[PDB]
Symmetry: D2
Subunit: 44 residues, 4 copies
Amino acid sequence: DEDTYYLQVRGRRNFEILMELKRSLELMELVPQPLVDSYDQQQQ
Amino acid sequence: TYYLQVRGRRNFEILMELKRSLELMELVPQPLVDSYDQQQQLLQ
Amino acid sequence: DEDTYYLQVRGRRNFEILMELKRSLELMELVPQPLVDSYDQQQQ
Amino acid sequence: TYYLQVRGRRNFEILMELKRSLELMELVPQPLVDSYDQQQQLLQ
């Protein structure tokens, strides 16, 4: 997750949907690794 | 139309797939949308 | 898009987010091919 | 917790990636969430 990309979307609600997911996808990179590995282990 | 920026190739690809689905949904013949939503209300 | 899959999620808002996207992803299969191909052509 | 059902392997995979991001977001140390949201308010 190093390079940045622009995205265009039509529709205010579509924009808000995508922004909520952009936030979650970018924030997940900040979870400390032991917490990620645990989450992933339990999802089995 | 709105812009957003996202960091990371996989994140961009996911968001693009979703953008495509949200915009294509507007091209579905409306009776098929109506049927889909009715079948779902029947279930849930 | 033939087999069906169950998904569990924690959080009412997370559930509503995912349901909105599930709907768009399933509905996009119903767009007539000439409309899909056109949309995809113009996104270049 | 809620269930949903989705038709199609690629659709399931997308929704799973998003479910993971939404649930992992809750494990991010809150000051890092705060910083992220501040940097975004600075921009937009």
